[PDB]
Structures are given as structure tokens and as C-alpha cells.
Amino acid sequence: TLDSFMQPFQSTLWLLVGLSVHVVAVMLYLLDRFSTLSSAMWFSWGVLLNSGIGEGAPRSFSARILGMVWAGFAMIIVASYTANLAAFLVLDRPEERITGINDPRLRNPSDKFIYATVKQSSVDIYFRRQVE
């Protein structure tokens, strides 16, 4: 579990979703003007950050359709983000550790796994009595 909040999405995806909102707001403002701008920008930002800002909605039919599609897109973005964030926030652990002495890890001692005991003791005598 990394100590951050931008982990579920990559930097490229963050940059793309940050650039998309600006061009969507610009297109909405242009369609509302040639068929106001700051209000549309704040609306596009509030339908993305889920805040309570936003004065009014545009009146053009195509503008209304585009705004509804952008709102549905922001909803899907938020849902995917929270799903990804909950995905690796719980149930993240290895299967099992060493439990027995007859495991193949101890049968083939490698250089990475180092294990020993105290010399001149009964544990060493018991360990040297196993012919296998």
C-alpha cells in the first residue's frame, strides 16, 4: 500500500482527463454562444469535482446533450477511480509463510536464505541425526 492518492491513475491519464475538461467547456461555451463562458466552465468543473457550484444550464439542445454526456463521463470516471482505489486498499497479503520443517526451502539451502542456531547444544545434535 503506497502512501499517495494518485496511484490508481497514471500521470498520462491524469493529464488527459485534465485537458479534456477544458476543451469540453470551451466547446460548450462556443456552442452556447454561436447557437456564459465562465458559467459553463464552472458548470463543467462542478459536474466533474461533484461540488455544489454551478449557476445554470445551457439552453441549446446539442449543448444539453453534450453536457449530459460529459456528466455521465465524469460519473464513470469517478466510479472507476473509487473502484481502483478500493481494489488495492484491502485484501493484499501473501498466501502463506513457512509452517513445516520438511519444506523444500530447508531441504535445499540456498545463499539467500540464511538460518542457523547456537553451537554446542542439543538442537544441533538433533539436527545432525537426520540422515535426510
Partner 1 sequence: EEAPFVIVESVDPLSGTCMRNTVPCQKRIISENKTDEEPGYIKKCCKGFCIDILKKISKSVKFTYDLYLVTNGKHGKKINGTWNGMIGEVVMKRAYMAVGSLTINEERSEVVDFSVPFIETGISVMVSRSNGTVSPSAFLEPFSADVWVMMFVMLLIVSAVAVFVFEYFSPGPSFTIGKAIWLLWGLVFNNSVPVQNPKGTTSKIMVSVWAFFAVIFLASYTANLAAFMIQEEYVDQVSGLSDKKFQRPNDFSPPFRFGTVPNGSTERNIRNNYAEMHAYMGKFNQRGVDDALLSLKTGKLDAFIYDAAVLNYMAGRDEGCKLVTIGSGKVFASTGYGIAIQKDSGWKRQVDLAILQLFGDGEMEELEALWLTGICHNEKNEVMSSQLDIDNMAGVFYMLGAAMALSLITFICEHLFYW
Query: Least separation, in Å, of the C-beta of 60 and partner 1?
Result: 8
Query: Least separation, in Å, of the C-beta of 90 and partner 1?
Result: 4
Nearer to partner 1, 120 or 130 (CB): 130
CB 65 within 8 A of CB 32: no
Identify the residue among 33, 88, 101, 113 touching partner 1 (CB under 8 A). 88
Query: Least separation, in Å, of the C-beta of 32 and partner 1?
Result: 11
Cell of 15: 493529464
Judged on CB neighbours under 10 Å (0-12, 13-18, 19+), 32 is: buried
* Residue 50, number of CB atoms within 10 A of its CB: 9
Ranges within 33-72 binding partner 1 (CB under 8 A): 35, 42-43, 45-47, 49-57, 60-72
What distance in Å separates the CA atoms of residue 49 and residue 28, rounded to the nearest whole number?
18
Identify the residue among 19, 37, 79, 98 touching partner 1 (CB under 8 A). 79
CB 46 within 8 A of CB 57: no
What distance in Å separates the CA atoms of residue 9 and residue 81, rounded to the nearest whole number?
7
Query: Least separation, in Å, of the C-beta of 4 and partner 1?
Result: 11
> Is position 122 annotated in a ligand binding site?
yes
> For cell 500521470, what's the residue?
11
Q: Which residues bind partner 1 (CB under 8 A)?
A: 5, 8-10, 12-13, 16, 20, 27, 31, 35, 42-43, 45-47, 49-57, 60-73, 75-90, 92, 95, 104, 131-132
Name the binding residues for glycine.
Answer: 122
